[PDB]
């Protein structure tokens, strides 16, 4: 089964092609993770996935999405991740982390607590930042302040500091969150970036924040550990042909800047779109990025059945299959997949205290 | 769905009828649980089960099955369970514990490391105790030492101390392990109990260790928290009708002694048996014990599908359905069952960080 072949990238070897993509839990306090996260991540790692990318972790307080988001903006925040890193490794999985800045989508309620921008008189809310003073709209009406050049320098340094903290906490894989309408994606998109300086306008200028952030992180993140990014390559906004061509060109420049693998996603930069949700719908687009930019890729958004995952690997559309919600439903999804794909000794996808009994069940 | 109706026993209310029965993990060291157990129990509790009975926990070192078994024979051992109690409660489940003594089946290798008695030359092993100096046989050939009267008093006190520790660690449900061929079951069974003193021979004498242990635990375990036991009610040894009748009579005595619920199982006292493994096969026997002894019951051994579990409750064969191996496969099995049984807002069987997204 292709899904259960190992994968080597730099000094990291994953035991299979099942990756758990970053999934915010909204359970942190002042950026500090706790026993929610410890059990959540350790249990999924024991389930058999080869790579576990920890949820979007804010590089700065105002870069959280919500008051429940994890942060890594201080050394104390980084130290809180050490037991998570070590528990993932103890389970035989590889610990990664996505470092992030929510941009104009920040200062929002948890999804089950309204999912919308926090009211201005609520002490929990904060002023958001973005390339331009333009609101997302819909449930996120707050207008961000437009970043200064000093803000751009500061946020880049926050990404650098976060990457060095992640390295010292023991993460073996890093993902820069340049997708999903957050700060990096919003610098790239003409919908959200109306700047008139070196960071807006032309393709080079709109790419600049992302390329400079990557280059600054590349200095501090080790060459021997995968340096990855998540990027929304189209918006489903009626501009898909031109946006794909630009996004693929940016992927080529990411590769020239030392990126090892690209997590291919959707932009979600504005609400006025028509995303054609369906099983494995990103497969063909991820394959085009992989082939045209000549970089390994992962993707998500509907690959969460064993056969869909296997087919995407056999078609060389992906190098790793990211399976998110299925792992919230069943932390042992990798074992479920091993059974469904007929892996020999499938129960030994799990540790011995489970595997021994399930072999004979 | 009957499987998702709450259950009240004494002061405890379970959010549904799904119980996770005790399942040894073989991952402790010197009786002390660790990160293996912490994540294992917390994750299953978040999965939605209403009751989580922690694995057989030895009341004394020689009462472990293996060198990896949990213990509660000191106050430090009990404190190690506190974070497990807290995590189970934080998930909205109810924490229970099975306290145990493996008797002649003790001093064995872990199941994936041979599953057999540790050899006499191997310093990891220890001398085992039992009612009589007679081996289980098969893969457990070591002949135990027959307990002295002082040994019997000591083991009873160990059960008392274990129950007191479980109480003060915050467990809300206790289960005495009188099943599965271990010490308590082996006092009851004529196969293993050849004693000629007050603890063997007649029905009263064979029951005595179990009834005295229950009574001693009763003096320390709170009246307002369920006091339960697991007991093998037949062996499938060609003596089933007589063994069932006297096991049910003992259950009546347990009831009179304050037992709140009986986990009905098989004896496993000797290897020479013919157990008819199959889906929900214990249903009819559990129902007979429940009805004849007038005690609430749970059982296991093949109820691990949503429809089998639901059917057993609708038929009033069980009060709680114990689902073991399915929770090792999927620690969110209760959520899987809620979906299968058409529970409204089934995803909210899980906590919010999962439930919100799975609803959509
Ligand atoms: C609860 C939840 C939280 C998420 N948080 C993140 C995140 O922190 N960073 C990110 O890039 N994507 C995040 N996503 C998107 C997922 O990584 C993934 O792309 C999505 O769940 C689709 O994959 P699936 O169909 O296998 O669930 C999240 C998704 C969910 C359901
Ligand atoms: C790994 C494992 C460990 C077990 N440990 C215990 C135990 O500590 N105490 C006990 O009374 N039964 C124990 N059992 C028996 C189970 O509680 C249960 O009766 C059995 O798994 C059958 O239920 P199931 O068909 O739902 O798995 C164990 C079973 C398994 C698979
Ligand atoms: C809908 C696109 O946005 C996401 O997938 C997401 N959370 O839901 C994140 O990226 C959190 C950082
Ligand atoms: C300096 C080179 O940049 C370009 O010419 C360009 N657009 O202006 C593209 O590459 C389109 C993606
Ligand atoms: C023979 C059946 O015995 C069991 O089910 C069991 N473990 O497998 C225990 O009870 C451990 C205390």
Author numbering:
A (entry chain A): 2 to 362
B (entry chain B): 2 to 361
Sentences from the paper on this structure:
The biocatalytic reduction of the oxime moiety to the corresponding amine group has only recently been found to be a promiscuous activity of ene-reductases transforming α-oximo β-keto esters. By studying the crystal structures of enzyme oxime complexes, analyzing molecular dynamics simulations, and investigating biocatalytic cascades and possible intermediates, we obtained evidence that the reaction proceeds via an imine intermediate and not via the hydroxylamine intermediate. All the crystal structures obtained had a high resolution (1.9–1.35 Å) and showed clear electron density features for the oximes.
To assess if the introduced amino acid exchanges affected the overall structure and the binding of the oxime, we also crystallized the tyrosine variants in complex with selected oxime substrates. The protomers in the crystal structures of the tyrosine variants are perfectly superimposable with the ones of the wild-type enzymes, confirming that the exchanges did not lead to major structural alterations. In fact, it presents a lower root-mean-square deviation (RMSD) than the non-productive binding pose, which shows a steep RMSD increase over time, indicating poor binding of the substrate in the active site. Tyrosine 183, the canonical proton donor of XenA,55 is also found at a hydrogen bond distance from the Cα of the oxime. Both the Y183F and the Y27F variants of XenA showed a non-Michaelis–Menten behavior, with a linear increase of the rate over the concentration (bottom right).
